[PDB]
Design an enzyme around this catalytic site. Sequence first.
Site, mmCIF file in Angstrom:
data_model
loop_
_atom_site.group_PDB
_atom_site.id
_atom_site.type_symbol
_atom_site.label_atom_id
_atom_site.label_comp_id
_atom_site.label_asym_id
_atom_site.label_seq_id
_atom_site.Cartn_x
_atom_site.Cartn_y
_atom_site.Cartn_z
ATOM 1 C CG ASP A 137 -2.137 0.869 1.036
ATOM 2 O OD1 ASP A 137 -2.470 1.206 -0.132
ATOM 3 O OD2 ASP A 137 -2.741 1.230 2.077
ATOM 4 N NE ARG A 141 -3.647 6.018 -2.424
ATOM 5 C CZ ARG A 141 -3.078 5.333 -3.414
ATOM 6 N NH1 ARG A 141 -2.304 5.951 -4.297
ATOM 7 N NH2 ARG A 141 -3.279 4.027 -3.521
ATOM 8 C CG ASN A 142 -1.439 5.204 1.671
ATOM 9 O OD1 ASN A 142 -2.426 5.583 2.291
ATOM 10 N ND2 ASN A 142 -1.519 4.447 0.586
ATOM 11 C CG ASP A 155 -1.532 -0.991 7.872
ATOM 12 O OD1 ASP A 155 -1.635 -1.937 7.052
ATOM 13 O OD2 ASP A 155 -2.254 -0.895 8.892
#
Length: 287
Positions: A137, A141-142, A155
């Site tokens: 992931d 954006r994370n 996460d």
Amino acid sequence: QALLRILKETEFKKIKVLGSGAFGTVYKGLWIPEGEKVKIPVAIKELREATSPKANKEILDEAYVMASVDNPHVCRLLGICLTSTVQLIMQLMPFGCLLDYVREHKDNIGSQYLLNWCVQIAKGMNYLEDRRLVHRDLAARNVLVKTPQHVKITDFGRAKLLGAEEKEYHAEGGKVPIKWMALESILHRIYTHQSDVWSYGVTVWELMTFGSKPYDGIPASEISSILEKGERLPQPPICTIDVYMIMRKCWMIDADSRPKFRELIIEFSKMARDPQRYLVIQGDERM
């Protein structure tokens, strides 16, 4: 070593929405311990979809590792709700994600900052790899901004712990971030630490372009065949041949030809200590 706290979903009050996607939605909320009157502001990330007993077991395993991270560049899981729908309880990150930061600070972000973010993200990923987590992931954006000098990987229940014997993870069907994924992942739904490296590469592309959209224009459907054709994301205008060639190694077809996260930490670390040799930004050292 085992710190994970499993809380009642009834102990949380949602207050406002911070964000929502396909995979779930983040609330600004309140933890109120049962038996207690104190209220404490958390971020509540709850998954859009319900999960099978298999799904939960996997989320629960990953969650136990997340709840115990040492590393300055990974967000630690505060707690979890395994109720009806799963909810990760994270610490509030009021600066928001790095993807947003670079889009609206484009004109004050220098080569020194970009290259330091790459080192930090790689350090967090390298650490996750040591804990045997495949993140699945990783995207701009994370990555969250703690301070402009300090970013952290977060996460949303998608990471997968690998058995001591395992080297792969084969996933079920469902929504996927297809434009950040290694080709093996798109074709065969297999994930490894090396497909994570592929995503690191796209995330670094995101940063170097100050928030550009990957393969913008192409539908998800073509991505697989375009990659098979040999096309990759274009060289960002500020990148020297040295930085770009690294991104290109991250998007190699053979995942064993992609760099390791420990090598990524070394390369970007030397670049980070001479930023202007590697990135050509206008007004660079005037920021």
